[PDB]
């Protein structure tokens, strides 16, 4: 594995620092490393493919070296080199892809392909170098084991969930009380509604609460919290809980009262914010709890009073809400987010080559399904597969 | 057991006897033997130096400026031309043991650009390179009787 | 002086044979002068 | 300050470019820089923490250099190194954190901690490098 | 075979006694043994698989000895070793598994696979050592016509059997007398019921008896015997013997009278216990006989008298019972028990690789079927297969 990495920063820090011009000196420490490789290789036959629509190109090795008898690289030097790199490029591609599909329950955290199982071999370790690519940096630290970690802009921690819970309902659905929400990606929107506008509620206040349990702990999260749930601020016709009929939601929005957001870790409050909208920090949590209330306005102008009668029919439905977005955070486990192409790379290679569904990943690498049942096996396979995708993107995008 | 060099030797026989040196010492010195793999050419000999000494001698090993040697390389230390100049015959006769070893000639070019100020010395070079030349330029033959 | 920290193991090769001058191994004769040819290939010195 | 920086790219470009195998010459320019540090350090004691729930861990120095001999790094080389880095890691953490809280109305732009006020010292500047972050 | 064993204690007492640190002479007697192996190997080629979903892997050998030196093992020494062990590990696994499936009738006790048939070869015997692993200790002694068994637990000697026997019945099933039981694993529960509460029985006592014949003799058994069969102390609706209808069982429990447990061997009473509840020892037996009686209470308070009328309908059914559990025992034949993973290992490897049903073992290695018809062939194959599973578990769990 670590092997694999080098093979690339080798080529990038190569196809990049080797051009018509420069002084040798820039590459002395480089050229060397390079050659070392060629040697170890030459003579070993490699096989890739043998699944779905994946060609089976075979590769032989018999390549010359790189004279160090020069100062300024003459064009002629480049071309006689690029021609030798373009075999490694078109190679690695066919290598990544091959181990970017196979899955294993028992040892999923390990290598699979007849291509890689041979790389972890000892006689090859003679290469490894310059491990500063965020992902490998983290692969290693995970095998000796310690405080690993990554960076994500608008991460993808919430499996898609869009539903409601009626705490008070009746067949006609003309006087409901409950909450409706949308948890997806890095965002949560939740609204609490009370058709009666807390007319018969103690202190004329109806309490609401929304709890979201993350499948992985997020640390160092920068979060935007805003009052109101725009998504649930418009008229809707919704299916009843049993699917037998449809109800009408005609919201009128009031400010959420006594807003309290708690970021908990193992049941303990790590961060708590009372009615603080804007940017807040949640430093370590596996659960978010949003509590908010609808308080019947004690003073109402005629126009307002008219919306909230003492008796049914209740035609304007009092609604309070919150919107929470995790802009950035760190997670000890790999996740999809709004900037990295890893998930898309893995999913794309599998789709393009018609790779059959395996025993670990959900059909189509479906994110919601994956994060909903993010087992240790899925995570180890995901990390292996994401790390390979990142190695590949250093050369092929 | 066979060991590294003289000093290495001495030391052992020496300590072996300073009674107050852990029964482990004798043991190690004892049973510890060389490493002799005929095939391959491996030889891992038991040694003893010092941190700063190992330091030295070490790199001396990891920088044995001695590349291999195939009929092919001999053939190659030859100008791309000449070989492709029919007029001249080439052939091999001696064999090559997988023991072959030479020392790189190190022919990095000019490095120093004297050809743009150090006239005084160029003149001395040219001169030189010149006589050199005459020494080679084959003498002529079959002329037309002067008279 | 601590022993174990001074004792090292040695990676040394085994039985080379160093060669200098080189060339020599080059067996080479030469055509007869009357049959010379330049990059030309027609023949150098062709005025019989 | 700039001091501080180095201490890291030192370790990263370190805990990263040093893996069982790599041919030495990818680090010659690196190893050197490293050692230079160790020297300047050894012999000077340090103090951190001293507020809220911030432990008051004390530190000392006395470490062997790094055999620049070998041509290809053997596993044994790594471990005897990682063990020396993990003291600098667990150190720097306790260092950053210490100056990541103290504040000053007047010169609230300069160093504060008894840890850093000593770093800006002159005898230390023998380290700075690779400021691309 | 014995060969196989070594290959492991070799590795365990290896991957265990060899670590960054230890002094020299703590491995001298060990290192040696090790090398000896390598030699014998290198050169000989091996093959595994070719049955069901079993990967047909090919193996080769050609590994250097050691640097039988250095005092306090230097890290570098380990890694250059672990890399050589991990080929033997991943090997042996593929070896055990291969011979952990093949069945043979006539003479099934012996080796089968193209992998092992070559191991029993003579040129290999140069390896056997440290046979203290309870199982091998017993394998050997068995090839030497000699006695000795294994220590088991909450053993699995009783094939599942849950039934009843009506000694007195009639179409309406309103006045039955008989017994019902559950024999399973190491436990027996049996109840004797008499709807008439021995109203017309001699001495107002109804005798009951339950006999269980073990398929193998158990020796040195520690047994818990308790009065009452909780399993048969509640109301039930049961199918009639002919399956044509259902009867009602409405038990009321009385203490079993004149309890006598006999542990017999070949028809002879070896141990007998009269009304002794708690912990009892049965030192050697192939049969258990439980005799107990229901005695109509000679004196009854009104509430009791009301349950037992002189004439039908009999609505409360007098029931007496016993519970017997074999906590531990020794058997000369391998058996499944509540602690060992052998049966589960063999069954699991066969299931995972879709191994076809063979001529010896019942489909799915079904324990009840196996122990019910525990033929000599099944036992020899089971022992071979259990011994291999135990060799495998020394390295792979
Ligand atoms: Zn138990």
UniProtKB/TrEMBL annotation, chain B:
<comment type="function">
    <text>Inner capsid protein that self-assembles to form an icosahedral capsid with a T=2 symmetry, which consists of 120 copies of VP2, with channels at each of its five-fold vertices. This capsid constitutes the innermost concentric layer of the viral mature particle. It encapsidates the polymerase VP1, the capping enzyme VP3 and the genomic dsRNA, thereby defining the core.</text>
</comment>
<comment type="similarity">
    <text>Belongs to the rotavirus VP2 family.</text>
</comment>
<protein>
    <recommendedName>
        <fullName>Inner capsid protein VP2</fullName>
    </recommendedName>
</protein>
<feature type="site" description="Interaction with the intermediate capsid protein VP6">
    <location>
        <position position="24"/>
    </location>
</feature>
<feature type="site" description="Interaction with the intermediate capsid protein VP6">
    <location>
        <position position="28"/>
    </location>
</feature>
<comment type="subunit">
    <text>Homodecamer; each decamer is made up of two conformers of VP2, called VP2A and VP2B. Interacts with a VP1-VP3 complex. Interacts with the intermediate capsid protein VP6. Interacts with NSP5. Interacts (via N-terminus) with NSP2.</text>
</comment>
<feature type="site" description="Interaction with the intermediate capsid protein VP6">
    <location>
        <position position="32"/>
    </location>
</feature>
């Amino acid at each position: 594995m670590d092997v694999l990495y080098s093979l690339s920063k080798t080529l990038k820090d190569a196809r990049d620092k080797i051009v018509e011009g420069t002084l040798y000196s820039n590459v002395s420490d480089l050229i060397q490393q390079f050659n070392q490789m060629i040697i170890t290789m030459n003579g070993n036959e490699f096989q890739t493919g043998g699944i779905g629509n994946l060609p089976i190109r075979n590769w032989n090795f018999d390549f010359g070296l790189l004279g160090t008898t020069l100062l300024n690289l003459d064009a002629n030097y480049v071309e006689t080199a690029r021609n030798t790199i373009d075999y490694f490029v078109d190679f690695v591609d066919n290598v990544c892809m091959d181990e970017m599909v196979r899955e294993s329950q028992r040892n999923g955290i390990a290598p699979q392909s007849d291509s890689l199982r041979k790389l972890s071999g000892l006689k090859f370790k003679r290469i490894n170098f310059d491990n500063s690519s965020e992902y490998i940096e983290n692969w290693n630290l995970q095998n000796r084991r310690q405080r690993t970690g990554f960076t994500f802009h608008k991460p993808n921690i919430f499996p898609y969930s869009a539903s409601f819970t009626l705490n008070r309902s009746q067949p006609a659905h003309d006087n409901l009380m409950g909450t409706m929400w949308l948890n997806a990606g890095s965002e949560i929107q939740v609204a609490g509604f009370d058709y009666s506008c807390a007319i018969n509620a103690p202190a004329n206040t109806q309490q609401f609460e929304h709890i979201v349990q993350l499948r992985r702990v997020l640390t160092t999260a920068t979060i935007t919290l805003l009052p109101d749930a725009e998504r649930f601020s418009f008229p809707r016709v919704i299916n009843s809980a049993d699917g037998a009929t449809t109800w009408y939601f005609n919201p009128v929005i009031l400010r959420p009262n006594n807003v309290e957001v708690e970021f908990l870790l193992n049941g303990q409050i790590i961060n708590t914010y009372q009615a603080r909208f804007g940017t807040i920090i949640a430093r370590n949590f596996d659960t978010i709890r949003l509590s908010f209330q609808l308080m019947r306005p004690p003073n109402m102008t005629p126009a307002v009073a008219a919306l909230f009668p003492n008796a049914q029919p209740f035609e304007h439905h009092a609604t309070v809400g919150l919107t929470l977005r995790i802009e950035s955070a760190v997670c000890e486990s790999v996740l999809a987010d709004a900037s990295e192409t890893m998930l898309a790379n893995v999913t794309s290679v599998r789709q393009e080559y018609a790779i059959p569904v395996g025993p670990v990943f959900p059909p189509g690498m479906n994110w919601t399904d994956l994060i909903t049942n993010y087992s240790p096996s899925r995570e180890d396979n995901l990390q292996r597969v994401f790390t390979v995708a990142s190695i590949r993107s250093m050369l092929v995008k | 057991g066979k060991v590294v060099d003289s000093e290495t030797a001495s030391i052992c026989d020496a300590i072996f006897q300073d009674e107050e040196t852990e029964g482990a010492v004798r043991r190690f010195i004892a049973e510890m033997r060389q490493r002799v793999q005929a095939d391959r050419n491996v030889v891992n000999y038991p040694s003893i130096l010092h941190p700063i000494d190992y330091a030295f001698n070490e790199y001396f090993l990891q920088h044995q400026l001695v590349e291999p040697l195939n009929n092919d390389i001999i053939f190659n230390y030859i100008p791309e031309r000449i070989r492709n100049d029919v007029n001249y015959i080439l052939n091999m006769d001696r064999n090559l043991p997988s023991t072959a070893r030479y020392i790189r000639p190190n022919l990095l070019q000019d490095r120093l650009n004297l050809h743009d100020n150090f006239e005084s010395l160029w003149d001395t070079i040219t001169t030189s390179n010149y006589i050199l030349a005459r020494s080679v330029v084959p003498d002529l033959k079959e002329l037309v009787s002067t008279e | 002086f601590d022993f174990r920290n001074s004792m090292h193991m040695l990676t040394s090769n085994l039985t080379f044979t160093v060669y200098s001058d080189l060339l020599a191994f080059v067996s080479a004769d030469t055509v007869e002068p009357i049959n010379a040819v330049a990059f030309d290939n027609m023949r150098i010195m062709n005025e019989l």
